[PDB]
Design a protein around this ligand. Sequence first.
Ligand code: ADP
Ligand code: ADP
Ligand code: MG
Ligand code: MG
Ligand code: ZN
Ligand code: ZN
Ligand code: ZN
Lengths: 49, 460, 635, 637
Amino acid sequence: RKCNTDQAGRPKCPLDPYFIMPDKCKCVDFQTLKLQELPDAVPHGEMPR
Amino acid sequence: SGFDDPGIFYSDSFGQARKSQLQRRFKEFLRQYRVGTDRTGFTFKYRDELKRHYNLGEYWIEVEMEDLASFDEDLADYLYKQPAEHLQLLEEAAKEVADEVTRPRPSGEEVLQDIQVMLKSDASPSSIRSLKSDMMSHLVKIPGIIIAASAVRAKATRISIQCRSCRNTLTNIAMRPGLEGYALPRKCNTDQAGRPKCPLDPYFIMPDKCKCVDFQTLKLQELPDAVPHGEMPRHMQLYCDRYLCDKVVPGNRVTIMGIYSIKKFGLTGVGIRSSYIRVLGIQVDSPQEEEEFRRLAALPNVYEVISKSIAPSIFGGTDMKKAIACLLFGGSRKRLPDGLTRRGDINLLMLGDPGTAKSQLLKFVEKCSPIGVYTSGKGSSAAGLTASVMRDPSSRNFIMEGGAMVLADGGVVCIDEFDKMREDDRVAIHEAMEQQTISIAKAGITTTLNSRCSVLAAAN
Amino acid sequence: LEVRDEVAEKCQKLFLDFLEEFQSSDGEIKYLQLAEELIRPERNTLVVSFVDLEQFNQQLSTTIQEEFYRVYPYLCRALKTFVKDRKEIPLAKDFYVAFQDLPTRHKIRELTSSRIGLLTRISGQVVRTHPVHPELVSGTFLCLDCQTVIRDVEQQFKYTQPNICRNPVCANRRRFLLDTNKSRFVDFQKVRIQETQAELPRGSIPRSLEVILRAEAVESAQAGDKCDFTGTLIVVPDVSKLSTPGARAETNSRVSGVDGYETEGIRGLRALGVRDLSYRLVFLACCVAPTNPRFGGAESIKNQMTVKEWEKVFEMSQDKNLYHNLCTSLFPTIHGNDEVKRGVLLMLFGGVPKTTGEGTSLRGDINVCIVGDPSTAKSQFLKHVEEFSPRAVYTSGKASSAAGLTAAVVRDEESHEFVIEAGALMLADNGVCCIDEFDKMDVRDQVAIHEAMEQQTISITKAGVKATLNARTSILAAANPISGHYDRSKSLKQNINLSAPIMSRFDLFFILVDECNEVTDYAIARRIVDLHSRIEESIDRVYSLDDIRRYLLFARQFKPKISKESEDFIVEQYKHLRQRDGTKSSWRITVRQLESMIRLSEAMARMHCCDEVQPKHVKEAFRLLNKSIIRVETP
Amino acid sequence: VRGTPVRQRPDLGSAQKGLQVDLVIWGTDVNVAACKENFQRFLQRFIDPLAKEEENVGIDITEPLYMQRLGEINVIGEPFLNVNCEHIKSFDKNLYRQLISYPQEVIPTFDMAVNEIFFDRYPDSILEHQIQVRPFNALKTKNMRNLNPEDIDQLITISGMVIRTSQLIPEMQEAFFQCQVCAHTTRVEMDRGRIAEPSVCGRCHTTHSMALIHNRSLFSDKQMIKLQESPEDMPAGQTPHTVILFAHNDLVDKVQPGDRVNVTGIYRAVPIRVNPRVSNVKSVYKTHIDVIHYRKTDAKRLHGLDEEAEQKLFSEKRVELLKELSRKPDIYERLASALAPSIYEHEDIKKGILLQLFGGTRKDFSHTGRGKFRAEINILLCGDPGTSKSQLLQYVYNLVPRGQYTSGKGSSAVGLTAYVMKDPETRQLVLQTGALVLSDNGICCIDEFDKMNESTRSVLHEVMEQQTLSIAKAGIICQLNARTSVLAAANPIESQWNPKKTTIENIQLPHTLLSRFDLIFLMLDPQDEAYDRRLAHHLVALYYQLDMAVLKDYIAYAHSTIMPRLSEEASQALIEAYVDMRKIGSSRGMVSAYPRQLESLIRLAEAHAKVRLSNKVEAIDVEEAKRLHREALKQSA
DNA sequence: AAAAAAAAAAAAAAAAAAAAAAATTTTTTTTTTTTTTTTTTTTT
Ligand SMILES: Nc1ncnc2c1ncn2[C@@H]1O[C@H](COP(=O)(O)OP(=O)(O)O)[C@@H](O)[C@H]1O
Ligand SMILES: Nc1ncnc2c1ncn2[C@@H]1O[C@H](COP(=O)(O)OP(=O)(O)O)[C@@H](O)[C@H]1O
Ligand SMILES: [Mg+2]
Ligand SMILES: [Mg+2]
Ligand SMILES: [Zn+2]
Ligand SMILES: [Zn+2]
Ligand SMILES: [Zn+2]
């Protein structure tokens, strides 16, 4: 929320000063799967969880 | 197409009188106050005043409350009851009428400066004891003696502030006059689409682009005669502004007209707000004359009439009158190409029995000279006979205490009891009476103060 | 200093006098006797008659009719005094006053703005009814800048926060937290009604408006009814109804904007409190009655019967020849077609639905089909049934997509719930649906009504709501033969193009051949021309339409047995019917025809309001089926 | 002024400041005093020179015209004075320019003038509010697409067809505020479209204690009328164009869909907010009209149902002229020849169309139980694409009020009955009606009826049978009215009436639908040589080229006054006629008779009775019905 | 070969997810200016 320098100048850094540096982020692969209950596992009248 | 934002435009107005009409009636007062009788020939006093002052580069005028009431009674009542904003209207009227009278001004002064409309009344003053709460924010008139006058510091009437991110400006905000503060805005209004906004407190006060005017914080004190028997004198601050600065000095006895007020610095002895008087007006307690004096030169018995008239009540001593007239006129100074100074003052001494009118004659000469100081040989009460330089502890400025010899420069010092004076004073006057320059070389600095007085000395 | 509404308080005084001093013809204070019943729970309104108002005091009556909105809470508090003084009710309970029997009447086209805020009554067909909810009337709030509670702020048909915090040195207009327990609500149902078919202008869609039903007049309306409503026309605030700027409120304070905060744009509008004022008419029904009431009020309905109508239906039941009398009364216009008359009458009476121990829902309704050559009064019979009965919905062929045919879905515009909009089968529930051009229904929906006929129920699961809607309606179908003309040398299943299961489900089938026989032709011509020349007379319905309609409603609740002798006759006669089947009929005989015959025997017992189906009924039912089923005529 | 308040005028719009400039109102030269006196001068002096007693009904012509209008106002009690912009133009031009160019102020000056004259006369009458002038018949704006923005906030007259009318929209007028501390009340009139809320009580002085109470504030009406312009000058390749009208207070609901109107109103251009919620507005401005006057009178069309219902519509001399026309011997043929002069000698066809225009006797049936009964006539015109059946349908569509036109499979059942659409103006799923419902109480002219696929032909059965219509869908579940008369134009199979095919197969329409119809004219080609020559001379004369007014008056009077009832002679004639029709109908090659054809004979007898203004249907009527129903279908041949 | 029925396509309308957008002064610290007091050094 607040820059931590104590040396930004005679004035201070504004409120919420940080912008994410996109290039300097090291990232990974991720995947949102939609797993559905096993059809033989589902009880008779219910619906697949 | 959406890359610009051209400004708004508006037009002149086509079609309890409103403040704009009070502005109009102040404009009428200035433009039409006719003072000169039809027998005496007429003149528009304030139109001529604005013209002359604005040409000179004075930017102020002096409007009498009596004239205001005579031309328009309701305006006078309005200024007495609610001076502040109605004074603002009056200043705007002075600006506009100034523009009218000097509309085709030459180049180099194209901008129209503001005008300070000082006001002076003739109503007898109230008393500092009588400045109770009910008389507050109404124009009050007060006598007093100033005792301390601070230095003229620059205070801002209109400012501009830049945004730290977008670098756009809020040019020419108006600072409310007085000792009135101003909280900065906390949002950059300049919104740009599809972009993150400027930060929370974006604004920094651009110092290059402001309008600033002087101001002086004086201290006024109850008139010592006006104080009751058992009572300490009352005091009041004053806030002199833009041409009331340096119009007075400490020690001067003055009458003021101003708005009894309060210091407005935020909502930060419960409920008390330190108070002052935003002073509007100050008073301090020809060819005809030149022709009279030329005739007086032309007279045969100018010597005799002056001699008689300087001691009309002092019996005898006609020769004494002669010599003292010669003194009061004084000789003449010369500064040859050698680089030296030749004294022009005439110095007289009266070594007399304790009966004659020595001290009375001195009192006459101090009254009758323009710049006259009557001092003993040991100075006067809390007032030295000769200047003294001091180095301040805190600011290490040179505080010069001025005595008789320097206060009364180009005039007469009546040194009563010349036969008793301190040795340091004696050694000072030894050269202050033939060089007229008192030299003081303290651990700080060398100075050669100018004591160009004439010594009328009285002793037993 | 609590300024008083002088006229409203005088109205409170005079109406309190009316309540406590108006006495019936018998001499007792009728509204004291009615206010006796508000002590009970689940009851918070009196029903005061506007004619009584007029008789007691014309001045107060005209004042209420002209200033109904302003006086309404005052009349409610007058009732509160009138009941609290006598009985020891809970102090917090609120009360209401319901007007009826109002002399004047208006129309949904007549409900103009000048009628705002003053009493008015209209008629309408209740399209749909949203669920019951608690609605906030008087709210208690808490200001979140000084924690002072602001008490009893009124809700003007919108969630209203207090206009400014009651504390003088706190100008909170934004941050308020509702204190739910301290606030008081009113039970509330929103319903949609539309213009009655009689009142349509030329080329005009039926307008529809929303009617709010406050406490105790809340479930009285129902979808499909024909209800008169009485109450105020109010205006409920709307917002963002138009894309063009319109009338907008704003404070009259002359504030300006300082530099850097200038009251412009969004900041400016929020500062001045600008808000559009877009409204919409929303009727506020104070009371609701059927527009054509059945009664002035089997054992419960019998108690509801007045003495005159009770003896009328009694002598109706005791009447013999009621059979042909009902035929004539239902169909004075028709000539001949006695088999169709009989079948449709029995259809109106219906059979007895039953259900097995296992859970098989035996059908009780009896569906009829009229098939014949063109211009043989088929659509006329369906129109007669429509115009006669209540809960008699009508539709024709390809004029009804399936969603409106059976059921649709909408989301509650107020809450999260969903309103299951009622289709033709639902509106015909426990009644009749007259389907015309039945043969020309798409498969997609003819299967839907087939499901309705099999199960008496349709379960809709669509667009985020599931429900199992009941529809016990009976179907009267009209079916044009293939080629336009019926062919007696072919079987019925190849004359028409219904699905085999649909044809199986159909209980009765009538064949109307347009043969050219001139004695009959003279009869028909004389009949219809007589009708046209003498419209108003030339009808001799021996029992009025209201009389027989009441008789149907009263007869419906009698459920016949089947005695052992009648059962013996049933089985032997079905055996004889199979012997006939064993030449050949145009549509073969199965066990479904046994089912049809027993249901029609039940419906004849229902016509005579018996508790036992007798051989008379069985014989007549068999005769009906035997004459319905015809021999295919090969040359 | 007799203590009679001047009423709010929402039509003129939000009032302006009314600033005065010394050279009138700012930017507009009107000279309110000059306008008021000029309008008084017009209102006394004007005597219409070239007018007609037929036009001005019940008005002494030589006597002061608009003062007699004021007298009608006094006796009736309707404070509306319908002034004619052409009268104003004829009397003086500059006043008319003032009215056309600056209506927004020129109207209240006229109302002030008219009230001055009104209580100069009649200082004892009672009126519910002051008199409101309503100008009309401006210079007809031929093509509204040609309206520049230099014509914004002027007065215009357009002609169109009302397609939609919204529900009532309230309009705040007197914001009634109540303090929530001391319950002090106040009222703020609509200042300039805004409600300056009081912001401080006037009795306890608390700030922002005053809440607006909605349903104690008085309101007005407003209704959005969606109209499509039917200009008389269509440029090249310009599609037609809907337009939005706003009708205020008493003008609400006085025009129903399908009604062709001449609407006179002030043009308006309004901003449109970019989103529903934001306050930015597009620099492009949508426009609409605020409506002062409805006028449902046009020379080329018959009197609408409103003019039928009104009583004081024909002078005594005009009704007597109608009576003696009824006494004329051959009035049936006179009117038949009067219909469609540009078509040659189709006397039977034009007699049928005439009977259709007359209709029959709309018979009440409510307590009979029979349900609604079609009292109208349906006609089919069967022929190859050489005859002029399309010409007849075009002519009847032009000539009728509440006409609608369809051709072939350029339609559908959904767009014929109704559909659900998001209105662009309110963002609401409103319901819209199709052609059959639009032409509710008039004529639907269907062309190329054979090429009408089964879905969009099966809906016509409902209309022709019941006069009702059902739309049971997810949109709404209701039952609209559609009491139209169908004028169908069909073609035989393979576009030619070949001889070696009976009539029903050559037509090839469903037999039930042909039963629905009430007359079926087979325009075979007569090969006759003299007919050929007369037709040829007729068309070439059509190149080298009764009154519509008397026709309209006779038809409208017949509708208004005389509803025939059967006579016993006619009933016996009808029974005999139908049994004879069935007896000839043994041969089913022709279109066999039905009880529906008996009903058709009933209706045609009633139509002949109305042609005679009979009030009693007689054997002459029934015999003409038989003869027409035989010559149509050509059952002799 | 043309009509009827069914399937697919095109286009408008609605429901939820997740990324964007907007609002937004007051109290404490502490340096600097000023005054005051005790002492030592210097002068009478
Ligand atoms: N020669 C004189 N003429 C007039 N008044 C005199 C004279 N001598 C003394 N006095 C009076 O005596 C008083 C003392 O005068 P002052 O000049 O003070 O005497 P000194 O000069 O001796 O002190 C004064 O009030 C004055 O009026
Ligand atoms: N037996 C009859 N009795 C009375 N009216 C009849 C009879 N047969 C036919 N009609 C007349 O025929 C008209 C149309 O019959 P309708 O049933 O609508 O034909 P469809 O069965 O093709 O719809 C009815 O309005 C009715 O007056
Ligand atoms: Mg002395
Ligand atoms: Mg039918
Ligand atoms: Zn910025
Ligand atoms: Zn608060
Ligand atoms: Zn109040």
